[PDB]
Amino acid sequence: HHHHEFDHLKDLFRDRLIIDKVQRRLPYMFQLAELESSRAGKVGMEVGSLRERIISSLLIYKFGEKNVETDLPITEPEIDVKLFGSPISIKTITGKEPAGVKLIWTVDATKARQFLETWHPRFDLILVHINWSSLGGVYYIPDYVQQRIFDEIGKDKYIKLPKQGTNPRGVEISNEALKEIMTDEETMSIKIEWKKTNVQYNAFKRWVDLWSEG
Amino acid sequence: DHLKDLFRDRLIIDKVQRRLPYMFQLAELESSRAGKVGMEVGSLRERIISSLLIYKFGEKNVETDLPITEPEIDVKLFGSPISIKTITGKEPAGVKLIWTVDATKARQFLETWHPRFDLILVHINWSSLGGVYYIPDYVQQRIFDEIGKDKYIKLPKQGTNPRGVEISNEALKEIMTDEETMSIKIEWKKTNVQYNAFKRWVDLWSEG
DNA sequence: GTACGCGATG
DNA sequence: CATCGCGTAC
Ligand SMILES: [Cl-]
Ligand SMILES: [Cl-]
Ligand code: NA
Ligand code: NA
Structure with missing residues (x-):
């Protein structure tokens, strides 16, 4: 169709x-x-x-x-x-x-510990690091990179449980595990300067107009 | 707050x-x-x-x-x-009532929360009958006063994977059906509407 | 009944 | 160190 561009993820990340x-x-x-x-x-x-x-x-x-x-x-x-x-x-x-x-949006303590004890990395990851008015990037982190790091440091260092007695939103990858998977030689990235544009927009207008019309 | 006007204007x-x-x-x-x-x-x-x-x-x-x-x-x-x-x-x-699953914080909510704010509750029932309900703060408070926090508030069930602290189904029924609650009946009829979530963005990638 | 998605901000 | 939004479906 007319909106088509004229290891598949590797090919994506190297396409000029x-x-x-x-x-x-x-x-x-x-x-x-x-x-x-x-x-x-x-x-x-x-x-x-x-x-x-x-x-x-x-x-x-x-x-x-x-x-x-x-x-x-x-x-x-x-x-x-x-x-x-x-x-x-x-x-x-x-x-x-x-x-x-x-890694999962589970806060229940029992279910979170069940995740810690059973999960390992299986899927290719596209991670977008957003850093408005500064430098970030999009990263292709192969499943085998995640598995390498997980194998090396173990579940108890890779996976961070929700802190009991706080109000969190899930089970996390540890910050050390994340930095290691992002910086592996086999991880690919496109660096991005997250420059803001002067674009505005009122979320309610569409709906107020649908109420008002006719 | 004049919300009753919305529920009385034909x-x-x-x-x-x-x-x-x-x-x-x-x-x-x-x-x-x-x-x-x-x-x-x-x-x-x-x-x-x-x-x-x-x-x-x-x-x-x-x-x-x-x-x-x-x-x-x-x-x-x-x-x-x-x-x-x-x-x-x-x-x-x-x-x-709150999107907290943590056991302690959920208990704290149970021990301190009471109804304070007017509620607009939209009951969706596709291909059937539901409604928009205006449930005043005073209706919620009266039911909460009558049944108490332990019957009104339902804690997340430990050992399951839920998403928050709930109003009990007993309490919800009582506030919804109270004589001082107002409503607009809605027949939730579906319309023929075509749409693809990705198209906008594929097209912007091409244009960009 | 019980499964689960999506991170920003104090 | 911590706070919080939004229910569907299975
Ligand atoms: Cl991950
Ligand atoms: Cl409520
Ligand atoms: Na995701
Ligand atoms: Na709400």
Whole structure:
């Protein structure tokens, strides 16, 4: 179709046109996502679900709709999209460096410990490190990189349980494990300067107009 | 806060009955994956209800500038906080008062919380009958006073993977069916509407 | 009944 | 160190 771009993830990350489009436009697209996922200028966690659409759409752009399977139930653990049948986890995180990234959105103490004792990395990860007005990047972290680090340090150092007596939102990858998987030689990245654009937008207008018309 | 006006104005009621299902269907279409609806649909439904308030009562009288992580309060109407909640089913069940699963913090909530704010509860029942309910703070408080915190508030069940502290189904039934609660009946009829979530973004990648 | 998605911000 | 939003479906 007319919106097609003229180890598949390796190919994506080395494609010069993809690199240029991501560097030039990912900030703008992510800014539209946040403008649609906020209230009083504060961004909701649900922005992640919209950013995920944007990243899956990059895959469709390069590889074609026939080769990207987006039809995964929204509550599926980990896997967000498949590329030529191969599962991909997408994660997004804002900060000077990524911190506190979740592996599962479970807070119950018993279920969290069950996860710690059973989970290991299985899926290729696309991690977007957002750092507004500064430098971040998008990272392709192969399943085997995650497995290497997990094998080396063990579950008890890789996985951080929710802290009891606080109000958290899930089981996290440890900050040390995250930094190690992001910086492995076999991890690929596109660096991004997250420059903001003067784009505005009132979330309520569409709906007020639908109430008012006719 | 004049919310009773919305529930007594025949003309606005008619627009709500004719248009709420369509708008809520769009919200679901934009909050799904593989045709399964995400919890975040509630945040978009809330925007639709706040917009109804803006239309009925005026921009000047509806404050929407509340942080997205504010507990309970979603909007203010003539200065008065309003909680908006949405729920799908044959009857409303398992509705959250706070999105805390931690056992200790959930207990603390149980021990300290009481109803304070007017509630707009939207009961969605696709292809059947539901409604929009205005449940005044005083109705919630009266039921809470009669049955007590331990019958009104349901703690997250330990050893399961839930999402928060709930109003009990007993309490929800009582506040919904109270004589002083007002409602607009809604026939939740689906409309033929085509939409693809990814198209916008694929097209922007191509244009970019 | 019980499974589960999405991180930003004090 | 910590705080909090949003229910569906299975
Ligand atoms: Cl991960
Ligand atoms: Cl309530
Ligand atoms: Na994800
Ligand atoms: Na709400």
